[PDB]
Amino acid sequence: HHTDPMVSKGEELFTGVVPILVELDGDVNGHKFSVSGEGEGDATYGKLTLKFICTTGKLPVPWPTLVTTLVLCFSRYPDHMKQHDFFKSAMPEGYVQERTIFFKDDGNYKTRAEVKFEGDTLVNRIELKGIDFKEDGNILGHKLEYNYNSHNVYIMADKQKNGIKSNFKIRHNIEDGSVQLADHYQQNTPIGDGPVLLPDNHYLSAQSKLSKDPNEKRDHMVLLEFVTAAGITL
């Protein structure tokens, strides 16, 4: 497929439909919760289909606030940009994804995830810590709409850490027509010691649709996500 054997290796892991498992343990202002997710990814189309269930009862934060936390290795990199795909190049050993997410005029999430293969399954295992949230605020108050906007994720190399870093803003719609900004700081590091592809500056264009399973009585979120790399003409 690719003249670059490094690109060939990552592309081969992600050919066809890959099963996905997500496991999150979270604590936001002392509200402990867990989330389990299952579905599949087809990196050929940048396409994710996942269903998440809060396994501890009622989710104490709005589902939309967890979308970015809850597998950018499924991003579609155009052929001319496949030398810039850090995420697949770190597989199968995987990468660590860390974020601080600052909710404007509210609290912050700190997240640490390991994304790696377990046999044929792509696994995303996450710890989330949330602090300084307002009890009557948009997050602990559940004032966010169950929907999602399209966003750009700006990626830069972090040569010193053999990885990447990203800044980006998520705008969550509030039920009064306003927006709750969630400022994302991200860094990703390989788990293996082997080489990875360090990208030139580019962005991912992400589109997310949230729905409900009409047959599901547990607190849950159905996610359809598309992610495509862009911003290099080369």
**Which amino acid does the sequence have at 204?**
L
Q: Which CATH number fits domain 5-230: 2.40.110.10, 3.10.200.10, 2.40.155.10, 3.90.1720.10?
A: 2.40.155.10
* Cβ contact 212:224 at 8 Å: no
Q: How many CB atoms lie within 10 A of CB 119?
A: 7
Domain spans of the chain? Answer: 5-230
CA distance 65 to 38: 18
Closest to 67 measured CA to CA, from 129, 141, 136, 149: 149
Tokens representing 167? 């800044």
Q: How far is CA 133 from CA 104, 109, 126, in A?
A: 10, 9, 20
Experimental method: X-ray
* Cβ contact 191:116 at 8 Å: yes
Give one DSSP letter per residue of 5-68, joined into a string. HHHHHHHHHTSS-EEEEEEEEEEETTEEEEEEEEEEEEGGGTEEEEEEEETTSS-SS-GGGGTT
CA distance 220 to 113: 20
